[PDB]
């Protein structure tokens, strides 16, 4: 059971700059009978099957752009992207086929760097449909921001609320390299009706100035 270790777990680089991803195995994958290394690289974008980029450590699959270069030998291999493009956002996996069972590395996520961008914040009251059934989900979208670190805070009538909050992050957008985040405050209908103002706050550790969006149940 050859262990394929991929370092680091995630990689961040600006558009146009060089990306180098490492993959460590446990045994030499070079065959001295024809001088070839038994290693392959795969690119997997969000929602898609893995796609073969490089086979035999350095042979590029027909159709892969020339900016993808594979190198290495023995137990240390490298995937180089000579100039990262917006579309290259993906998870990159190495795989050995020297001995059964074929094993894959845990993958290295490629993140793109770009200028800071404040989230576009939208807050939504519970729909009447949900309220009729006894529920009250207050939804807040924090869309198209950078960098990934962002902390949402919920306040009900001015007081912080932490119970009933569930958060969800998209993968980095392959067009503008931003992130988006969804935050749902799930309350009962009775508790939602017991208060008036609901506030979603987008904060980040580097600043004290949040981005605030609120609504009033009555107006």
């Amino acid at each position: 059971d050859i262990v394929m270790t991929q370092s680091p777990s995630s990689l961040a680089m600006s558009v146009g700059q060089k990306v180098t991803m490492n993959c460590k195995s446990s045994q030499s994958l070079l065959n001295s009978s024809n001088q070839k290394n038994y290693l392959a690289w795969y690119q997997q974008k969000p929602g898609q099957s893995p796609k073969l980029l490089v086979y035999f450590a350095s042979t590029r699959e027909s159709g892969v752009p020339d900016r993808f270069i594979g190198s290495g030998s023995g137990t240390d291999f490298t995937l180089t992207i000579s100039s990262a493009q917006a579309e290259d956002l993906a998870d990159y996996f190495c795989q050995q086929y020297y001995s059964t069972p074929p094993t894959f590395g845990a993958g290295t996520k490629l993140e793109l760097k770009r200028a800071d961008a404040a989230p576009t914040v939208s807050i939504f009251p519970p729909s009447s449909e949900q309220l009729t059934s006894g529920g009250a989900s207050v939804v807040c979208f924090l869309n198209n921001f950078y960098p990934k670190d962002i902390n949402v805070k919920w306040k009900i009538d001015g007081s912080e609320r932490q119970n009933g909050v569930l958060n969800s992050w998209t993968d980095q957008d392959s067009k503008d390299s931003t992130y988006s985040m969804s935050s749902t405050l799930t309350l009962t209908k009775d508790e939602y009706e017991r208060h008036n103002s609901y506030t979603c706050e987008a904060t980040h550790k580097t600043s004290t100035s949040p981005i605030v969006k609120s609504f009033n149940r009555n107006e």
Binding site: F93, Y97, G107, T120, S137, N143, L166
Partner: protein
């Protein structure tokens, strides 16, 4: 073109069975070995099984040996994975793939199927509740898809007419059910003068719901 069309995934109880299918086209099927590779909820790829060109030799991951059976109908260009005595640890997205090179021993995979999801759980299939998200330059609308099981659901806007400015967020687990949301951002002149509908599908419950976003 080479296409590997999978089918057969779904929800199944622990100890149950399920048969996955992989239909191939665009290459000489009998001249290639075929394989199954699964991917765990943490996006970890894992080879499962490989069958030779004529099926005389099969190879299995030790975790599935004696529980899964690989087979191929070379006349119908179809690959099968018969899974039995399923455990929760088998929950994963299952891919079929063509073992490249046509030779003995493992190799790399060039062509992958689109993947089918297998959920091993004793939880029951639950349809989602779909709620419109309307606001109380550009305007952001949404809809909330709450309390469904199992994965997946597909959310579109205006039947795929609105592709740009859409954010469909990954589902989270709440009370043994999944909940996700989706936002769409359109110009002010579009909404509310025009009609913005979120289309939600949950194939596991045969659920098909359209929710029109109406102003508050």
């Amino acid at each position: 073109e080479v296409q590997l069309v999978e089918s057969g995934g779904g929800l199944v109880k622990p100890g149950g069975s399920l048969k996955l299918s992989c239909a191939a086209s665009g290459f000489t099927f009998t001249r290639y070995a075929m394989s199954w590779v699964r991917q765990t909820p943490e996006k970890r790829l894992e080879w499962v099984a490989t069958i030779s060109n004529g099926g005389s030799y099969t190879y299995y991951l030790d975790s599935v040996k004696g529980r899964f059976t690989l087979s191929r109908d070379n006349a119908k260009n179809t690959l099968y994975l018969q899974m039995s005595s399923l455990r929760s640890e088998d929950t994963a997205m299952y891919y079929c793939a063509r073992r490249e090179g046509g030779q003995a021993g493992p190799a790399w995979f060039v062509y992958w199927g689109q993947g089918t999801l297998v959920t091993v759980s004793a939880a029951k299939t639950t349809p989602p509740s779909v709620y419109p998200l309307a606001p109380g330059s550009m305007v952001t609308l949404g809809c909330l898809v709450k309390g469904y099981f199992p994965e997946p659901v597909t959310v579109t806007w205006n039947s795929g007419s609105l592709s740009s400015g859409v954010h469909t967020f990954p589902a989270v687990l709440q009370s043994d059910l999944y909940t996700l949301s989706s936002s769409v951002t359109v110009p002010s002149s579009t909404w509310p003068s025009e009609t913005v509908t979120c289309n939600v599908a949950h194939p596991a419950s045969s659920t098909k719901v359209d929710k029109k976003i109406v102003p508050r």
